[PDB]
mmCIF file of C-alpha atoms and ligand atoms in Angstrom:
data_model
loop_
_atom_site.group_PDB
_atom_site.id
_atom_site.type_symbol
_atom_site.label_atom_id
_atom_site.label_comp_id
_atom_site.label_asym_id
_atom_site.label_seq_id
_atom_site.Cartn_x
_atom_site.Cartn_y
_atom_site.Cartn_z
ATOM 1 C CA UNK A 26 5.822 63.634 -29.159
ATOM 2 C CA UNK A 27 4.187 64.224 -25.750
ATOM 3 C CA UNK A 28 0.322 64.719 -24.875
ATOM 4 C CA UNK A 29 -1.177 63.682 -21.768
ATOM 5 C CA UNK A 30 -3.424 64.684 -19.247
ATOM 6 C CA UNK A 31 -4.581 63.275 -15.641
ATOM 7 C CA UNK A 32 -6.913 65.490 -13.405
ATOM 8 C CA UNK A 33 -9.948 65.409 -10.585
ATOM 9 C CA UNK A 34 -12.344 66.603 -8.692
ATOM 10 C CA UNK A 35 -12.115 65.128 -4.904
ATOM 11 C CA UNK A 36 -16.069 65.651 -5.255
ATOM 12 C CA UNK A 37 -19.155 63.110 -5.362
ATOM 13 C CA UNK A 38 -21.317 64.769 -7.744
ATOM 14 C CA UNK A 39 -20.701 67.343 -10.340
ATOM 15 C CA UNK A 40 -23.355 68.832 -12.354
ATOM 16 C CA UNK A 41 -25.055 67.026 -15.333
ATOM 17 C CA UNK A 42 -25.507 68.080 -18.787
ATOM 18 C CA UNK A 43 -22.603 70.006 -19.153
ATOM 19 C CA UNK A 44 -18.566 68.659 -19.507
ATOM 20 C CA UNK A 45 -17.295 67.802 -16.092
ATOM 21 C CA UNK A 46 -15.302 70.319 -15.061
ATOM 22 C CA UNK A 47 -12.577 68.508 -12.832
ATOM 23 C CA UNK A 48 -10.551 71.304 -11.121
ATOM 24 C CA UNK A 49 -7.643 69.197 -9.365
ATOM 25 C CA UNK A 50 -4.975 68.450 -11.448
ATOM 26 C CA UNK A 51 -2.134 65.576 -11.767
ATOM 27 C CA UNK A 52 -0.676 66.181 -14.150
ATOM 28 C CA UNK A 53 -0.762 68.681 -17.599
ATOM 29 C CA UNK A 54 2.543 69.665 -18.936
ATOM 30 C CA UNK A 55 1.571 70.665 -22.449
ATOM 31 C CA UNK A 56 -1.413 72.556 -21.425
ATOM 32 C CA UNK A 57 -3.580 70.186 -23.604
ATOM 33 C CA UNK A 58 -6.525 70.355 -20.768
ATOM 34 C CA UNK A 59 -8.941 72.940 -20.608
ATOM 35 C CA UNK A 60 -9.279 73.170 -16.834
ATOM 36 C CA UNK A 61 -11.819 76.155 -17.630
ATOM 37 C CA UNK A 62 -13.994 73.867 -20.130
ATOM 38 C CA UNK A 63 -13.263 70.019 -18.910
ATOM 39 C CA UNK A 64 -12.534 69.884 -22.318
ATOM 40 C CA UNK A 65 -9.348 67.956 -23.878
ATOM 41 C CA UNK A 66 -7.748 69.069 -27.281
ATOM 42 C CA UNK A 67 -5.900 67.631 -29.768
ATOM 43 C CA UNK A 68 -2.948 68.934 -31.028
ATOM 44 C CA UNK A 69 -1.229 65.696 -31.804
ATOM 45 C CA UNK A 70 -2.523 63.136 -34.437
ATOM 46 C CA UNK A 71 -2.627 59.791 -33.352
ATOM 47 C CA UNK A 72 -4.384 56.909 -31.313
ATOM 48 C CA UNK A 73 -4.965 58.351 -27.440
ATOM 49 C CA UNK A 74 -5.962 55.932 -24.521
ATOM 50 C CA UNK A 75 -8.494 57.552 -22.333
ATOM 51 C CA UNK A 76 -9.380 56.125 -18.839
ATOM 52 C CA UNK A 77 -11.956 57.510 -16.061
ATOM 53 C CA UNK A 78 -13.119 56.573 -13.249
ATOM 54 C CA UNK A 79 -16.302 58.341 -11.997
ATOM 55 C CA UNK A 80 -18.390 58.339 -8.408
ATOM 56 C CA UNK A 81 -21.588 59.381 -8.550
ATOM 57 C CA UNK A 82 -24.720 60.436 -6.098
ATOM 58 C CA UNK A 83 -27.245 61.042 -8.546
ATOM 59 C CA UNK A 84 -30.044 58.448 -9.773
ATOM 60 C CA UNK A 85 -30.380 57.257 -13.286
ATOM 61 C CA UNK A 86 -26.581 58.004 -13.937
ATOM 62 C CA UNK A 87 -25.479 58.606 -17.512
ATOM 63 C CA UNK A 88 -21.615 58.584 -18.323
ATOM 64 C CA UNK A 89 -20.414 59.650 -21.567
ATOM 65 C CA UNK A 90 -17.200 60.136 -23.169
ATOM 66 C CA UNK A 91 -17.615 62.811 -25.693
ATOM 67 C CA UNK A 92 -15.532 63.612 -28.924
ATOM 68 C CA UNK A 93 -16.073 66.545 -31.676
ATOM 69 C CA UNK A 94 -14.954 65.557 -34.610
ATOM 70 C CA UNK A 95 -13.094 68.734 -35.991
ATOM 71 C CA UNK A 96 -12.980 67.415 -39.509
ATOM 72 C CA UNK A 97 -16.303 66.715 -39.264
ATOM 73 C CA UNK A 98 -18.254 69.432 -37.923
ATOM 74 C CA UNK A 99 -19.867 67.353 -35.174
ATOM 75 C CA UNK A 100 -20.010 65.973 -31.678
ATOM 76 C CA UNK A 101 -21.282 62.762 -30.787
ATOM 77 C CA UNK A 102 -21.343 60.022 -28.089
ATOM 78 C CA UNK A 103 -17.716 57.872 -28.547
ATOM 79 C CA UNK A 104 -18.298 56.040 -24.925
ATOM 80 C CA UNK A 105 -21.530 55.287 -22.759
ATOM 81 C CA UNK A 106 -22.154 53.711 -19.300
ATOM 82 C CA UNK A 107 -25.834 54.190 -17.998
ATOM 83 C CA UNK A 108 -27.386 53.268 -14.004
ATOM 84 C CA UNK A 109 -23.660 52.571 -12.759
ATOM 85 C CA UNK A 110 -23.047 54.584 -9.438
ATOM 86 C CA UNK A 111 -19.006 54.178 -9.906
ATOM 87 C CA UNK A 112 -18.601 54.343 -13.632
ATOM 88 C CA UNK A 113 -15.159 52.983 -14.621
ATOM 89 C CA UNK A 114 -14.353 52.759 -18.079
ATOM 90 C CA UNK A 115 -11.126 53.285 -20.444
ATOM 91 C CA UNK A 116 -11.056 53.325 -24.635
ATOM 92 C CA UNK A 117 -8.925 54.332 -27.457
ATOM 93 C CA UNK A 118 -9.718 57.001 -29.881
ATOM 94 C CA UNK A 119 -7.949 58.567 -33.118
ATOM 95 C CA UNK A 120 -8.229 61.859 -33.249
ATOM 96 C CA UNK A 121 -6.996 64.672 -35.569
ATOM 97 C CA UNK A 122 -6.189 68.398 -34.927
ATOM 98 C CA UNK A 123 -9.070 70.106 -33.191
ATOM 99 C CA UNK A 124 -10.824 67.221 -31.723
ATOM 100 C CA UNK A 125 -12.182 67.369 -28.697
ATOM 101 C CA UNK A 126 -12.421 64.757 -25.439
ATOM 102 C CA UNK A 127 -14.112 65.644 -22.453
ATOM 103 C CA UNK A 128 -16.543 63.370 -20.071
ATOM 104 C CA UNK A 129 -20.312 64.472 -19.313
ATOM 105 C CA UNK A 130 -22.445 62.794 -16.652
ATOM 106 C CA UNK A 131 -26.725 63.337 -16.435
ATOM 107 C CA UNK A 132 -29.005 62.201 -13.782
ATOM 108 C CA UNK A 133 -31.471 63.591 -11.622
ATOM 109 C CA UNK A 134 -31.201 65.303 -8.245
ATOM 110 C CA UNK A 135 -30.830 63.809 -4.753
ATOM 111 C CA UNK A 136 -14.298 60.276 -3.327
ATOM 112 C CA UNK A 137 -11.648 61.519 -5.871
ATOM 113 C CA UNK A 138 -13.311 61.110 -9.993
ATOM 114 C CA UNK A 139 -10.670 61.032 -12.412
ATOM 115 C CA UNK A 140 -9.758 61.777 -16.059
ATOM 116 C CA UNK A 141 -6.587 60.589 -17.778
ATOM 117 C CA UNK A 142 -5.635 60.517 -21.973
ATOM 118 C CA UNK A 143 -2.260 60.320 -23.296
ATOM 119 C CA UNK A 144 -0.762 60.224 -26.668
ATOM 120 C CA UNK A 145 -0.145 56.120 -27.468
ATOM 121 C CA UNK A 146 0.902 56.083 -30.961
ATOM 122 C CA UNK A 147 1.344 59.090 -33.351
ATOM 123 C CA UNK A 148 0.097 59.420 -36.729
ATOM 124 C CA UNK A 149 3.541 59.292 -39.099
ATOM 125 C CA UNK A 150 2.772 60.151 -42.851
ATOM 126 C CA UNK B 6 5.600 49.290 -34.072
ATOM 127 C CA UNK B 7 2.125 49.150 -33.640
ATOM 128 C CA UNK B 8 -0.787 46.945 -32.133
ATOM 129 C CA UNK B 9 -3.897 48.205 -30.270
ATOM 130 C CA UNK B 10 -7.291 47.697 -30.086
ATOM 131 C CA UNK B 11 -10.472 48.927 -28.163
ATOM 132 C CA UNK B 12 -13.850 46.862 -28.585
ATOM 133 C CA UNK B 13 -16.856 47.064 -26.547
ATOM 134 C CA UNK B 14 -20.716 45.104 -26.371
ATOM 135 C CA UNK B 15 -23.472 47.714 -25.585
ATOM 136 C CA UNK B 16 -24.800 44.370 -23.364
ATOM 137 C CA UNK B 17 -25.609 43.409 -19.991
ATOM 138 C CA UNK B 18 -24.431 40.074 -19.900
ATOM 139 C CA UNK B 19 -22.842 37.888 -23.062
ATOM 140 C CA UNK B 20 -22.728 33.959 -23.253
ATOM 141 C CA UNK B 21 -20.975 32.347 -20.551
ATOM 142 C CA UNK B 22 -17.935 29.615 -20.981
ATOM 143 C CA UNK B 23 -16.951 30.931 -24.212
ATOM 144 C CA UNK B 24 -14.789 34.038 -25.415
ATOM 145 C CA UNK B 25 -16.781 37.311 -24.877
ATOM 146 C CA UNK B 26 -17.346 38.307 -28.794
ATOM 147 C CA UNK B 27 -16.796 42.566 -29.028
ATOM 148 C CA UNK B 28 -18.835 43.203 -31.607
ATOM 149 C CA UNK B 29 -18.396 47.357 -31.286
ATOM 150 C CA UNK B 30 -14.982 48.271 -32.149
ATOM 151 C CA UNK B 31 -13.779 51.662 -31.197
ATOM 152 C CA UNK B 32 -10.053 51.094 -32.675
ATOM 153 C CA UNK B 33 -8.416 48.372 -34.940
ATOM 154 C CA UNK B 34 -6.069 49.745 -37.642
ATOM 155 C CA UNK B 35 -3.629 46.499 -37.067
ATOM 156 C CA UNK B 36 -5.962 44.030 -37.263
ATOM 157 C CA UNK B 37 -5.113 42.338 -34.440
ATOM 158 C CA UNK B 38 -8.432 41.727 -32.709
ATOM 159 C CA UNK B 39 -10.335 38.754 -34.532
ATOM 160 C CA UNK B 40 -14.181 39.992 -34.171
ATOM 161 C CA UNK B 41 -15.172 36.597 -35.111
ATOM 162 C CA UNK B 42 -13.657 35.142 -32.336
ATOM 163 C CA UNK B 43 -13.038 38.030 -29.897
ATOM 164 C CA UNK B 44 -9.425 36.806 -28.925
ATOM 165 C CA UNK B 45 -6.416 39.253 -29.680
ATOM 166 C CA UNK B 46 -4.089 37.237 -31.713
ATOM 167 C CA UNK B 47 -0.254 38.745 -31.145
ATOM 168 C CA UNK B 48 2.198 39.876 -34.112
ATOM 169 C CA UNK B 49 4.805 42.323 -32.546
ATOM 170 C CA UNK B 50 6.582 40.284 -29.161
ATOM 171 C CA UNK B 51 6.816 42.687 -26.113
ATOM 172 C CA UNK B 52 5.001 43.860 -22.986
ATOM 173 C CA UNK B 53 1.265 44.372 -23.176
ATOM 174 C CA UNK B 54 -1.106 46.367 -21.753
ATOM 175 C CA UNK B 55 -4.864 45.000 -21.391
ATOM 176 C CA UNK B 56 -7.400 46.551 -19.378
ATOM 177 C CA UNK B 57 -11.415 45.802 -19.411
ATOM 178 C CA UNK B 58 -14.619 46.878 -17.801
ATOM 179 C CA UNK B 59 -17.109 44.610 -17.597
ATOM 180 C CA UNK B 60 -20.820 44.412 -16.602
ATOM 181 C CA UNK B 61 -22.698 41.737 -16.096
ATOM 182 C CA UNK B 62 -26.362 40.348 -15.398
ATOM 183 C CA UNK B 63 -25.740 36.832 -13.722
ATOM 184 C CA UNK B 64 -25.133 34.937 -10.573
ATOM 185 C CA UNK B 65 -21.578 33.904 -9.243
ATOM 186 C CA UNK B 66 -19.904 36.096 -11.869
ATOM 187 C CA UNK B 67 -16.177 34.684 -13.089
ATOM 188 C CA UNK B 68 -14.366 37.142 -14.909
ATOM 189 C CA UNK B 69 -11.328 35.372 -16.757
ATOM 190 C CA UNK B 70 -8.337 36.914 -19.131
ATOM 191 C CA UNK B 71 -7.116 34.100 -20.748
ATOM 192 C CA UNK B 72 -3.814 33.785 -22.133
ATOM 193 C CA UNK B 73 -3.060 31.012 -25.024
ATOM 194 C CA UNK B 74 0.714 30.575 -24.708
ATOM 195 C CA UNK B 75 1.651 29.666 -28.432
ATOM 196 C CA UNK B 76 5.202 28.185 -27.420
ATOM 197 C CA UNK B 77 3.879 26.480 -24.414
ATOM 198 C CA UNK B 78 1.352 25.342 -26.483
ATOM 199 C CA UNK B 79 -1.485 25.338 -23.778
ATOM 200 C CA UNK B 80 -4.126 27.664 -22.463
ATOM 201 C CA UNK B 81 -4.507 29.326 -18.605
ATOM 202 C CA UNK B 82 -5.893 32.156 -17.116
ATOM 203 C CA UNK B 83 -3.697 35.018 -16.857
ATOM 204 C CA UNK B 84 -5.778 37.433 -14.334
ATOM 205 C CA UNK B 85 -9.441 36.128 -12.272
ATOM 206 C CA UNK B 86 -12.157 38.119 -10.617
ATOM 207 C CA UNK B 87 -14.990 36.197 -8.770
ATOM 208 C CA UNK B 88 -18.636 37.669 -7.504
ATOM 209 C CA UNK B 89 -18.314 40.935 -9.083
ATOM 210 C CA UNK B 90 -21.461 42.647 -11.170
ATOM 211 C CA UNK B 91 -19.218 45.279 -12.527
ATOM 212 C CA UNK B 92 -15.556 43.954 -12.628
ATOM 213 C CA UNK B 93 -12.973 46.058 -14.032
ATOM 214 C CA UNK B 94 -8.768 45.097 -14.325
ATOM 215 C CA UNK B 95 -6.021 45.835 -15.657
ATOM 216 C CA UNK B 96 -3.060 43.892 -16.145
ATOM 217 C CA UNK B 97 0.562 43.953 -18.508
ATOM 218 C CA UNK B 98 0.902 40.532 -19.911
ATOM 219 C CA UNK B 99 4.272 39.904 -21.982
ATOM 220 C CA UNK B 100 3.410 38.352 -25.439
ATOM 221 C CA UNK B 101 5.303 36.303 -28.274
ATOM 222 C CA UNK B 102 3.976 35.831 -32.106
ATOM 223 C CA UNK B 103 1.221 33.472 -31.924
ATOM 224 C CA UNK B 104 0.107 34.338 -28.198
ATOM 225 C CA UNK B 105 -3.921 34.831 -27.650
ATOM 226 C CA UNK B 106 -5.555 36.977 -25.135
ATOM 227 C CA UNK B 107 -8.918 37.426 -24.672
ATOM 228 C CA UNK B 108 -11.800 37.424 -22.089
ATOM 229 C CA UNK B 109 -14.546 35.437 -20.409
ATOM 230 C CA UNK B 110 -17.237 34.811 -18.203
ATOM 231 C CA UNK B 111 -19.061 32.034 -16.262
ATOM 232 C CA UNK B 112 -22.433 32.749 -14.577
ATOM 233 C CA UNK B 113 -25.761 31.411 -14.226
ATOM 234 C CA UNK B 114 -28.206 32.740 -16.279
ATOM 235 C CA UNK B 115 -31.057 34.787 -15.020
ATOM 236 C CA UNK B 116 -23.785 49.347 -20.786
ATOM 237 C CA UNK B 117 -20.823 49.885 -22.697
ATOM 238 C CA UNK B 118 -17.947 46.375 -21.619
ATOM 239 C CA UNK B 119 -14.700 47.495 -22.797
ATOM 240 C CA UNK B 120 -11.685 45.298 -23.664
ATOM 241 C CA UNK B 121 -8.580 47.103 -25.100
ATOM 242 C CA UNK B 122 -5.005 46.237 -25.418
ATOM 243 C CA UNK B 123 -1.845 47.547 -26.733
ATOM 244 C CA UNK B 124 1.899 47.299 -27.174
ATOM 245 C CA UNK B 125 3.601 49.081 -24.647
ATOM 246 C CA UNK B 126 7.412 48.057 -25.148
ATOM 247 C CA UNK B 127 7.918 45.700 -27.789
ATOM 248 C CA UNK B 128 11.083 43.333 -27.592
ATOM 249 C CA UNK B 129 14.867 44.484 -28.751
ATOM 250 C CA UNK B 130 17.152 41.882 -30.069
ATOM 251 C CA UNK C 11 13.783 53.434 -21.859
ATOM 252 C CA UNK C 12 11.579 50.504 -19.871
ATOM 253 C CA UNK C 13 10.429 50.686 -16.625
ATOM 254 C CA UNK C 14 7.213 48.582 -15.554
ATOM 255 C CA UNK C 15 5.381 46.291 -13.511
ATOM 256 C CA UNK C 16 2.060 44.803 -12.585
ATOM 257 C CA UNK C 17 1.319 42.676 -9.555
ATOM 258 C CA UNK C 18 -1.628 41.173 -7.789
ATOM 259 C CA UNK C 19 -2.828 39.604 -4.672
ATOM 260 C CA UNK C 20 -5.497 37.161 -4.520
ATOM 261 C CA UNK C 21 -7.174 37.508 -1.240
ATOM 262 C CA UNK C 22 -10.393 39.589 -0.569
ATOM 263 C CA UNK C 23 -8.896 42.365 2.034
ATOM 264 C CA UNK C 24 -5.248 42.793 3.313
ATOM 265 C CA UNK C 25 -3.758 44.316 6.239
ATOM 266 C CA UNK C 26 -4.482 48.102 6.679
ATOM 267 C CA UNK C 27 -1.800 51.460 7.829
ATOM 268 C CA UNK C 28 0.500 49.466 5.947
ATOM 269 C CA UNK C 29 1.623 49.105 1.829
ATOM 270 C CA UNK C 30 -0.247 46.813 0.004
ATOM 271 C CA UNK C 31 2.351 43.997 -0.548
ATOM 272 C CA UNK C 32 1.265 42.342 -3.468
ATOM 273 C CA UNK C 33 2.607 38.989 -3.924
ATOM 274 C CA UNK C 34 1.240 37.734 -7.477
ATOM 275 C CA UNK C 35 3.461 39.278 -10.446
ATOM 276 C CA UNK C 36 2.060 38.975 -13.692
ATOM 277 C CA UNK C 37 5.312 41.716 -14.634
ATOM 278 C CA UNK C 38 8.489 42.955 -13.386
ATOM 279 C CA UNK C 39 11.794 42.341 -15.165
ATOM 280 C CA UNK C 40 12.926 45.939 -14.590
ATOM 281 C CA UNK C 41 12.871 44.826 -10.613
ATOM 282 C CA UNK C 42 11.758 48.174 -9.941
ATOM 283 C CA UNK C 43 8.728 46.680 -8.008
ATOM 284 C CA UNK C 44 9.662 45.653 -4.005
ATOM 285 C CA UNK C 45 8.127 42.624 -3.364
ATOM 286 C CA UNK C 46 9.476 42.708 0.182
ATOM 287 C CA UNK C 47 7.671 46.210 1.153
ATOM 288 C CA UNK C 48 4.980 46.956 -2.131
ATOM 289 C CA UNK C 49 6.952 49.996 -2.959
ATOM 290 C CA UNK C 50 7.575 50.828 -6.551
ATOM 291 C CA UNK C 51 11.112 52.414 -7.170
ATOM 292 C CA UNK C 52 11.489 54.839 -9.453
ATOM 293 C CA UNK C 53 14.990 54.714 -11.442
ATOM 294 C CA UNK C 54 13.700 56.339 -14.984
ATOM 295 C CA UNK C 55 12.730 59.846 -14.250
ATOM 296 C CA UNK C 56 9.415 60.635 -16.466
ATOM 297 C CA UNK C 57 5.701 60.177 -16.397
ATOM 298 C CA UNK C 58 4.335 57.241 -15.047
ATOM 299 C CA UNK C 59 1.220 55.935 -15.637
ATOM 300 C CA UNK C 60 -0.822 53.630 -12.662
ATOM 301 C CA UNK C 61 -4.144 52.287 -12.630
ATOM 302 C CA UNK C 62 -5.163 49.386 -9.855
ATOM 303 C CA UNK C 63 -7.955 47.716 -8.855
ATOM 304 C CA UNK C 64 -8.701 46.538 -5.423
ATOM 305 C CA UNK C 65 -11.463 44.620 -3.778
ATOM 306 C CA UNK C 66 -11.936 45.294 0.519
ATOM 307 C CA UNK C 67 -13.575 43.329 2.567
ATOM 308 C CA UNK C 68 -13.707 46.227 5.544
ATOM 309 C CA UNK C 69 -15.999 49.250 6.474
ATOM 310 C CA UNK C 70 -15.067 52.382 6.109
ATOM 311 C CA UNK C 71 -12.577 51.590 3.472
ATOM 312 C CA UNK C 72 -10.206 54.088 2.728
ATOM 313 C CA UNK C 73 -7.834 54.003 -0.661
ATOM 314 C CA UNK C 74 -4.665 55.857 -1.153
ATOM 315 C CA UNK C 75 -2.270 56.154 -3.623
ATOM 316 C CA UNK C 76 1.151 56.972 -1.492
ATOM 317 C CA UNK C 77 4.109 59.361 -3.232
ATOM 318 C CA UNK C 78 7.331 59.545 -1.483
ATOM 319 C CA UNK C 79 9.175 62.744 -3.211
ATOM 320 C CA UNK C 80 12.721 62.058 -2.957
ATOM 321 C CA UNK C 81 13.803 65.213 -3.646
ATOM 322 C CA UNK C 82 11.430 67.381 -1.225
ATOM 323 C CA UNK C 83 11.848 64.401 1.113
ATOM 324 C CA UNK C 84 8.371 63.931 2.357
ATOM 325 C CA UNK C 85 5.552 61.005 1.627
ATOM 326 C CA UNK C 86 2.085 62.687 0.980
ATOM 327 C CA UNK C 87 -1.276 60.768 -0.668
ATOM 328 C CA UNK C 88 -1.386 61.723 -4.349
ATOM 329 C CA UNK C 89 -4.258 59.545 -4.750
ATOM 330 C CA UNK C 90 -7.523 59.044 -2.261
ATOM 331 C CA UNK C 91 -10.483 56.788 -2.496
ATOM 332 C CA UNK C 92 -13.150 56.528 0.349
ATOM 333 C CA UNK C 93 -15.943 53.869 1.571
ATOM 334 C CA UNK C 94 -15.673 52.326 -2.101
ATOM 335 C CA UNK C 95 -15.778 48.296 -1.970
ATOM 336 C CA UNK C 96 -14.577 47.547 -4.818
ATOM 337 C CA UNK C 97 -11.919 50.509 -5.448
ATOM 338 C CA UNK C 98 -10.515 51.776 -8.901
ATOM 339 C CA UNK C 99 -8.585 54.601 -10.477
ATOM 340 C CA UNK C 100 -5.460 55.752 -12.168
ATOM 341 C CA UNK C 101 -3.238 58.817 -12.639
ATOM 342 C CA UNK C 102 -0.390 60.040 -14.481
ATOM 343 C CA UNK C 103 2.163 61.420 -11.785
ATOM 344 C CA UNK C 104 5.821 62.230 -12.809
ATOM 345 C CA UNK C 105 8.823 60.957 -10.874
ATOM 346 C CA UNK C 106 12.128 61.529 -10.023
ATOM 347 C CA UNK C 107 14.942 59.102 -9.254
ATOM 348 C CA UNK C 108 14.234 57.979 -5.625
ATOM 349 C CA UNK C 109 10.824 58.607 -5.847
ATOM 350 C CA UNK C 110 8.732 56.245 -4.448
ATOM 351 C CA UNK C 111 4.995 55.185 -5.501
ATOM 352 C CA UNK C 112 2.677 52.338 -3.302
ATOM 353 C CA UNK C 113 -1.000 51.723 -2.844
ATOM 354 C CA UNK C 114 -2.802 51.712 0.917
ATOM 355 C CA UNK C 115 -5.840 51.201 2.573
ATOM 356 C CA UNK C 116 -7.350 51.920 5.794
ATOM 357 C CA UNK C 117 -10.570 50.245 7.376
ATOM 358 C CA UNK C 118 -12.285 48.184 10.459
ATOM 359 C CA UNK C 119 -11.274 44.495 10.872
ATOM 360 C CA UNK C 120 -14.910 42.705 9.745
ATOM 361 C CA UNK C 121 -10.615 38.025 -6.089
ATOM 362 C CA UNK C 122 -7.406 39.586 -8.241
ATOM 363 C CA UNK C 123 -6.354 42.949 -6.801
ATOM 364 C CA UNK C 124 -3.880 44.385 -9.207
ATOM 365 C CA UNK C 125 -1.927 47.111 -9.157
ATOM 366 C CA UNK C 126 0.031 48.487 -12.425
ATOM 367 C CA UNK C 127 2.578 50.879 -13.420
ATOM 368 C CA UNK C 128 4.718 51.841 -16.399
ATOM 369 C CA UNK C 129 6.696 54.369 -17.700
ATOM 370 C CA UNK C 130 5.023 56.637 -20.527
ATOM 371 C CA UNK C 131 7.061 59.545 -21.258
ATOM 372 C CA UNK C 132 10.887 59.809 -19.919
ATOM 373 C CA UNK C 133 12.415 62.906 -18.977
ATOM 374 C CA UNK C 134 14.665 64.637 -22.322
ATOM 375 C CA UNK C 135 17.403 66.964 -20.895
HETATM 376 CL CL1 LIG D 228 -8.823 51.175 -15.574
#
């Protein structure tokens, strides 16, 4: 059972309010990352570690890791860093066919930022 | 063979000179994280992941991962950081049943802080 | 299938244009880590997982995560951090046997630095 995913953008800031799109890519073997969206998906049950590490040149930063929960019927928050220029952070999150990762970033106005999940432990039932 | 767990704060800065106490706990299914105590108490021998973000809001920051060795029967600290406002590690620690790992700070007094952990190999004999 | 290590170095900035030879090993009974030259050996093809945290005390710091493809027989930077202090990241990157994988930095002449990789998904053929 193999699910991973470790791509960036080689930029300082992207744009806010919307899923970081990072373009460069490490590594994606089972075509599991959305490089159109910035959006991971699930197609693997099981307990995923996710790890980022984010530069940004914007003021009042904002990091959040984002999941939709498919079963559910709704996205919300799972992760939040907040006035952190380099955000680092790393988690681990269950998720179920059809969820959804992806990292979003707000701030206002006036370096390579990565993004990296794998499969730790699948769900056996 | 399972163990993980993810746990954050939503703090600036915890108590100092004691174990930092994740109250927010983003995965636990083992339960092998002690939220009382916020040390990781170790059921399944092998090589261990940990990795932690930290922020904090004192002077001379001391970021600690303590180890408890249960056969060695005394306590040390496994990884240090020194002076850092936002320290982040990572580390693989090998474990045996009864081992402890968990965090701490020293500071003087005057944001998601992350601490997860999970098996990586476990032992084979 | 094991292949890991994790190593540190205590000091505040080491010597640049050169691998980081960490001294401190919190992991390595694979001895796929050099401790001579900082260079991690790759003898389990697969996808690797590494994640390091490093603290400079230069200007115009300049992190890089060095991959020495065996097979097209050429050393390029997979990884690149710039005029960061206190430097994170990780990255899944697959390897081959011979492959080699080390950290560097560059900067002007004017606290655990670690440095961590493992093995996540080996090669089925
Ligand atoms: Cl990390």
């Amino acid at each position: 059972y193999r699910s991973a995913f470790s791509v960036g953008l080689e930029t300082y800031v992207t744009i806010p309010n919307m899923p970081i799109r990072f373009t460069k890519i490490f590594y994606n073997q089972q075509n599991h990352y959305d490089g159109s969206t910035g959006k991971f998906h699930c197609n693997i049950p099981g307990l995923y570690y996710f790890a980022y590490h984010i530069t940004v040149y914007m003021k009042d930063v904002k990091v959040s890791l984002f999941k939709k929960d498919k079963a559910m019927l709704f996205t919300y928050a799972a992760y939040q860093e907040n006035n952190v220029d380099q955000a680092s952070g790393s988690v681990l999150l269950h998720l179920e066919v059809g969820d959804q990762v992806w990292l979003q970033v707000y701030g206002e106005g006036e370096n390579d930022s990565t993004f990296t999940g794998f499969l730790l432990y699948h769900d056996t039932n």
